[PDB]
Structures are given as structure tokens and as C-alpha cells.
Design a protein around this ligand. Sequence first.
Ligand SMILES: NC(=O)c1cnc(C(F)(F)F)nc1
Length: 165
Amino acid sequence: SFSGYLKLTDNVYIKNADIVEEAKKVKPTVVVNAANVYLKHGGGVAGALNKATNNAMQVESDDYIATNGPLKVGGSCVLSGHNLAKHCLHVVGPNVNKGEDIQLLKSAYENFNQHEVLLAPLLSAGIFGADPIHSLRVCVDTVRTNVYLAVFDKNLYDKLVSSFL
Ligand SMILES: NC(=O)c1cnc(C(F)(F)F)nc1
């Protein structure tokens, strides 16, 4: 199972780790992708997860979008986890660099409650532009299921742990 995580709350754990390397090691039931509405996995966590699947995630995602259309900001879909996990839960947090409503971050985290355990990044953090301290706060106050957060950046991980209320 998950190792080396710091326990933040009854159900939220955190580790300074590359979510791709973490997924390859744990092979969790669910890995969360920091997706956009088009499932265009170009950069950030999405680009990294997709590259690890040798682009199979993007091929599957394009077929999903061709059939279903785009996701909503705050929404999700369950697709294959490929070589990384049983499933990938593609969750769209608001991208504040695209002027999206930060209030939708709670709706985005609510998707995690449909899965008993997940390996996840902080939603809307990184290239999505939100404050990761705020994202962790919304995560702990919204997610009730077991969430193992992988924070790529060591300096950000230390700031998140040291400032956690
Ligand atoms: N394995 C990678 O190449 C990798 C790159 N970038 C990231 C990011 F975006 F979370 F920081 N995580 C992993």
C-alpha cells in the first residue's frame, strides 16, 4: 500500500513525491489526473501522467471527448489507469490562469468522495494557478474518503506541512 505519507487528518495523507513514480510503484485503484475540460493532457500532472502511459491516456481521452463532449469545470470522468492505476479519475479543477471561478474547487474535490481511496495531486495547484495552501484546505474540508496527496515540489511540500492548520 501507500508508504512514507505524513498523516494530516483522519483521511488525508501527504507525501513529497512524483505522482507518476508513486502510481507506478503503488498501482493504486484510482489515480487522480489534474485534467482540463477537453482532456488535453499537455502539461503539468496531466502531461506527465499521459507521457507515462506512452500517450494511451490521450488516445482514450480523445475517444471519450468525441463521444461525450467536454467535461464541466468541477466535474470528472473515470477512465482507464493504463499502466499507472486500475482507473484514472480525471478531475477538472478551476484554472485561475484561464480566469475560471476558484469557488468551483470544492465541487472538483467532491468527485473524490465517489472513491474509497485515491492517489491524487492538489487540484488547481501548479500550472492551474491556485494557491496550493488553499487547495489543501479545501481538500481536507471536502474529501471524506482516503486521499493520498503527492506534492511534486519539496519546497511546496514543506510549506504545505508547516502551515497546515
Ligand atoms: N514524471 C514527470 O515527468 C513529471 C513532470 N512534472 C510533474 C509535475 F507536473 F507534477 F510537476 N510530475 C511529474
